[PDB]
Write a protein that holds these residues in place. Structure first.
Motif, PDB file in Angstrom:
ATOM      1  N   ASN A  87      -3.201   0.178  20.949  1.00  0.00           N
ATOM      2  CA  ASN A  87      -3.319   1.365  21.685  1.00  0.00           C
ATOM      3  C   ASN A  87      -4.694   1.799  22.333  1.00  0.00           C
TER       4      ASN A  87
ATOM      5  N   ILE B  73     -16.390   3.332  12.403  1.00  0.00           N
ATOM      6  CA  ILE B  73     -15.277   3.773  12.683  1.00  0.00           C
ATOM      7  C   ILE B  73     -14.482   2.489  13.290  1.00  0.00           C
TER       8      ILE B  73
ATOM      9  N   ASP C 102       1.308   5.812  18.330  1.00  0.00           N
ATOM     10  CA  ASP C 102       1.670   4.400  17.648  1.00  0.00           C
ATOM     11  C   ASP C 102       0.573   3.427  17.870  1.00  0.00           C
ATOM     12  N   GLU C 103      -0.348   3.078  16.872  1.00  0.00           N
ATOM     13  CA  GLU C 103      -1.526   2.400  16.861  1.00  0.00           C
ATOM     14  C   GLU C 103      -1.377   1.119  17.590  1.00  0.00           C
TER      15      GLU C 103
ATOM     16  N   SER D 242      -6.183   4.330  23.998  1.00  0.00           N
ATOM     17  CA  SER D 242      -6.337   5.470  24.463  1.00  0.00           C
ATOM     18  C   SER D 242      -7.685   6.567  23.642  1.00  0.00           C
ATOM     19  N   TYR D 243      -7.514   6.135  22.174  1.00  0.00           N
ATOM     20  CA  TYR D 243      -8.329   6.845  21.396  1.00  0.00           C
ATOM     21  C   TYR D 243     -10.039   6.242  21.648  1.00  0.00           C
ATOM     22  N   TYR D 244      -9.796   4.838  21.829  1.00  0.00           N
ATOM     23  CA  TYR D 244     -11.144   4.184  21.999  1.00  0.00           C
ATOM     24  C   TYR D 244     -11.606   4.462  23.290  1.00  0.00           C
TER      25      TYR D 244
ATOM     26  N   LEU E 217      -3.380   7.112   9.606  1.00  0.00           N
ATOM     27  CA  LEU E 217      -3.203   5.719  10.164  1.00  0.00           C
ATOM     28  C   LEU E 217      -2.298   4.967   9.729  1.00  0.00           C
TER      29      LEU E 217
ATOM     30  N   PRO F 145      -4.938   7.435  15.117  1.00  0.00           N
ATOM     31  CA  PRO F 145      -4.959   6.399  16.489  1.00  0.00           C
ATOM     32  C   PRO F 145      -5.128   7.153  17.830  1.00  0.00           C
ATOM     33  N   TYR F 146      -5.333   8.570  17.857  1.00  0.00           N
ATOM     34  CA  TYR F 146      -5.430   9.286  19.352  1.00  0.00           C
ATOM     35  C   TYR F 146      -6.371  10.133  19.098  1.00  0.00           C
TER      36      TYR F 146
ATOM     37  N   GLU G 272       3.263   7.051  22.057  1.00  0.00           N
ATOM     38  CA  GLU G 272       2.334   8.127  21.795  1.00  0.00           C
ATOM     39  C   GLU G 272       1.799   8.270  20.264  1.00  0.00           C
TER      40      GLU G 272
ATOM     41  N   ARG H 235      -8.525   8.970  10.401  1.00  0.00           N
ATOM     42  CA  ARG H 235      -8.834   7.922  11.346  1.00  0.00           C
ATOM     43  C   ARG H 235      -7.496   7.576  12.328  1.00  0.00           C
TER      44      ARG H 235
END
Lengths: 307, 307, 307, 307, 307
Positions: free
Chosen positions: C190, C242, C148-149, C192-194, B19, B247-248, C146, B245
């Protein structure tokens, strides 16, 4: 060359990181060498405590910086002392707390037998300018086993050798070999917490997973096997939240995989037993008598993969 | 300009934060340049260890501070050494432990193939005052794969280039290009712990979720599918407590989502099978024969989304 | 007053703490001002690297300490440089890594749109002694989305203003206004993960909780609804282990509460359906036809509370 | 004695540790006193920034080290400033970030009302050499409640008192009383995240545990009550992974214990109802009508133990 | 030898690490000795605050560095003070925050009764050059029990002894004995949080596991016992995420193992009861009347292993 005698005292060895492959060592290091005589105030040896040493280094006094080869970063030196006798010999006593690396194979995790290695070397002076005479390692800081994550076994193996650097042959004609001290303290991990808290519950859970064949219904057997599979996935947490995060598999991880495979194979066996019928009139009596054969075969497989 | 030869030794590369997109590198850096000759005591080269260097910097000796471009904060420099030969050349040997950044795309997480990059540059002197001649990176610190989170593959790719800064053209007329060294060490992540501990249990759990269609009752199928859904939500923990963890999403996260969708689609299929009856007299025989078609279609979908 | 031009380069913005409402910023700051001319060695500008600057501050050279207003503690300054031209102008180039605070409202957590603010101000000199002329912020350190948090959107908004301090009017007659620079870098989280890992499983689990009404037995419905409630309490973990520990509720927390209420309302509805009988002869057919009305009403309520 | 006026600015109060009973305070402290006049360059006051102050302390300038009594370790002082006016008065402006202790009773955890206390005292000078005249605390750093873990209520209560040390009467004849400043900033914890995310799910789960009495079978009631007990043990995690690890029990912990006791008492009640039969012919109708009496009695008990 | 009187004030004892066997102690240490008289400015004693002490050490003033034997690394010294009276006696007042080690047996974990030990010793001067006269430890920092992880019982036991070093007899003829101060502060752990939150839920869960024998069906008993086993594996988490990670077993861990064994023995008992039939006609009435004998025997076993 100047002959330096090292004496290393290990106060404790803690902070074992397994994914980092480091460990924290606290202790003292004494380096005693000889030189030109000097006039101390009186016949007594002179004590130069921390800080005041650098005034003497500015004056021109020779104190070599014996670095640790396997340390990670700069060690947290506390108090340092310089004892200067009138006859000409110098003692440098420094207290260190450092994070040191090693190989540290962690396969067979609860029954680990590793060694903690301190590699001391002059930062600048090769064997033509500085030579280590002898090292005695006083790791008297060993005690009971009852409250000890790691049990130190035996003494500390000390070796004085010469390391030849290939890059220094370009900048130095033929004087490029450095005197290195290797200190190895062998330790054995305490397995009783892992044996009682992680191995025995795994055995009990895997045996309870074996016990799914004593039900007398097929749908009961599938729903029970899924409850058992849910019980296994949970044990994985308990351990993975507590066991170290090394980058391979251990005995406990392999037993987790074995329990997974046991429950999956039991599911396949009971589905095959129920759907072995050619026209739906034959019961499940013969291959459902793997109540005392499937655990025996799984135990034989486990005995194979453990050894 | 003054020609500086750099030699970087990598002791270890650890502490990979995903992360943060950083990694911790320990090692040594040697910078050797030439200058005006000086009179050392005797014909021997002079050693100026840590601290004592700053006295020589006060005196007027030129030591350039080669910073790391991609480091995060100030690196923990341990011992530094300055070797001054009588013929006129200077060697600056500094031990560093730093936290360095990179791009570090972590998609395809268990089978990551990334590179760890060290970018060295003079903090002050452009290519008209300091120029890097050559760099050799001695990353001999590579070893087995059996106990290695990351396997270093090949050597370290070294590049010396010139970086043109746009902001410095306002303060400098035409001398604003800095000599930069880029060192790339390519590593491949060890996948065996993730493959055996996280991928294979996911396959076993998803197959056990497929096995819900072999029950002969509708209410049993719903209650069983809800037990399976509860089993899946739990696997999510196990992984999310252990996997990094980032971010994707990764392969394991996508397999988790796929198992979620498999159980939800099975619930929809069995509800649709039970309530396909026009008057409640027809059984569930035809579309309940997706015992070996729904897993095949899901495996085809998974094969599509993996590649 | 002395006119100072600031140029701030942002290497990265990481380390976003939500309960602390801080974020870590690494970068460089250049402060260029003018003064009296001096005689450098030759016509070349003089470079004073770290440490050696304090000798010049002892000599009487004016270097103002531009502090960060919103930083938490002392920033980790790495290398600092002082460029002194013969014509009379000074450039102070310092590399910083600091932890900075802001307001940082974290409601609508997966779709956060915040700004990271750097507030620079002289520690001592007001607008009558030091004045900031212009700031250019070179945050060229922005890249793909792509991996990047946070996606930095647009440029950095720079403002130079004057802050009037009320406490300084007691100690200073009428010169108590300090020149402050505010730099705001707007970023979007970002999602998309969440969205894929936390929102879609919540939707699938809540829909599976809706599906409890398709059973044909009352006791089966209660036991199934309790299994569903146990499934929900577990999802709470996954997320709370998380997601950040901000001090309020977010969209995911509100969806968790909504699923809790859905299962509780389903339990109340099926208990009321079974015990609506006046003498225990009437079945559950009418209000048990909320299979496609209760999800619709819950979705309408969710659509109300989201917007 | 020398009269010193203190002015403390609180930038933020964060980092509340409950098992450590500490909290992190960032801010500034200004200490202004008077002394002998001096000749500054010109009529302007002289600014001595960080570092350069110690040259003036070497010269003989009196700057007292006002320590924090309740700080844990040495505070991270950032920039310090010394303003010396020609008329004779000195201002010492230091920025601090420290970890401070207090009593901090954390019973009634979600509705905590505590105070954060800064205790400032001269390290060396008693009331016969240094005396604090007045303190104004400018905690203007208070804001909304919507994004605030703790809501600061009111102003900061400031007290200047004298502390008599018993040990100093042996080394000092009658001058052993030190001037101490106590600053108390009262704060109230934000309860909405804990109320919506931890209290309401506990109420819903305990009510669902009450609903076990509406089943019409004994074995169903036991298996359901065990599923409910498994649901409770899991909620304990969710909270204990998120709530602070204080060394006592709180409202949420007590509600957890109450739910445990509710499920255990329900198990005892249904077992006693099934085995109240003298010969196995009597049903469970009378004491199984505690569907609306057992929740009422438990709510009365909870209302007793809350207040 | 020079007689030094030590007075140690303990502000707090926190940060108890159990796998590290350390604890964090904050406080002050005062060392008062006598020497040659000096001329202070006036008749008043002279105060030398931090930093300025090292100027006096450069001048030739004797300040011994009293180190802590059991500290881990270098303690975080804050402000230090040197009081020099005109009559000839010196007082050294230093504030420390350190991490100290001890034996710290953590068996009987919730009812621990340990002692926190500070071992002070001169780093350089033996009993022929420095001798500790007396120590008074003013640990007045003890308070209520209601908000206290550890309750300090009694006063602090202080001992002044002489430690004979075996290694120093080679470098020193007969003067190798160092004056050591041992300070032991006895503390008792607060058990109420562990008793109410971890022991009582274990008792309730184990009793609910006993209650599996009151079902009237064999398959119900097995499925119920597997649900109970799944409930136990989960409690293990709750505790292992919260309890310290000491390297052995405690009372709570032993109760966890006991509950595991209880459920496994119940499974074995009910399987043996169902398959005790010689031809499948005899029921399970006699050995299934261990409803009030198996809990009694297990409680007797637990009473044996506790004491």
């Amino acid at each position: 060359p100047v002959d330096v005698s090292v004496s290393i005292f290990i106060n404790k060895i803690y902070g074992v990181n397994t994914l980092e492959q480091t460990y924290k060592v606290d202790g003292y290091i004494v380096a005693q060498w000889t030189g030109k005589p000097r006039k101390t105030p009186g016949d007594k040896p002179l004590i130069v405590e921390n800080t005041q040493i650098e005034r003497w280094i500015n004056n021109g006094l020779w104190v070599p910086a014996l670095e640790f080869i396997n340390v990670v970063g700069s060690p947290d030196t506390g108090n340092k002392r310089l004892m200067l006798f009138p006859d000409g010999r110098v003692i440098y006593n420094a207290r260190f707390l450092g994070s040191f690396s090693n190989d540290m194979d962690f396969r067979l995790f609860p029954f680990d037998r590793q060694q903690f290695v301190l590699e001391l070397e002059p930062f600048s002076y090769n064997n033509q300018q500085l030579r280590f005479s002898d090292i005695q390692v006083y790791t008297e800081n060993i005690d009971n086993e009852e409250i000890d994550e790691w049990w130190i076994r035996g003494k500390a193996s000390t070796h004085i050798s010469d390391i030849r650097y290939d890059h220094l042959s370009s900048v130095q004609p033929n004087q490029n070999e450095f005197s290195r001290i290797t200190v190895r303290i062998d330790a054995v991990r305490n397995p009783s917490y892992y044996l009682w808290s992680f191995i025995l519950p795994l055995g009990l859970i895997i045996a309870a997973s074996w016990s799914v064949f004593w039900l007398e219904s097929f749908s009961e057997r599938l729903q029970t096997s899924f409850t058992l599979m849910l019980t296994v996935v949970a044990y994985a947490f308990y351990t993975s939240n507590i066991l170290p995060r090394l980058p391979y598999t251990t005995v406990i991880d392999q037993m987790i995989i074995a329990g997974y495979g046991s429950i999956f194979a039991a599911i396949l066996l009971i589905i095959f037993a129920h759907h072995r019928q050619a026209n739906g009139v034959e019961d499940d009596l013969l291959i459902q008598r793997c109540r005392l054969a499937f655990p025996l075969g799984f135990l034989a497989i486990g005995c194979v993969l453990v050894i």
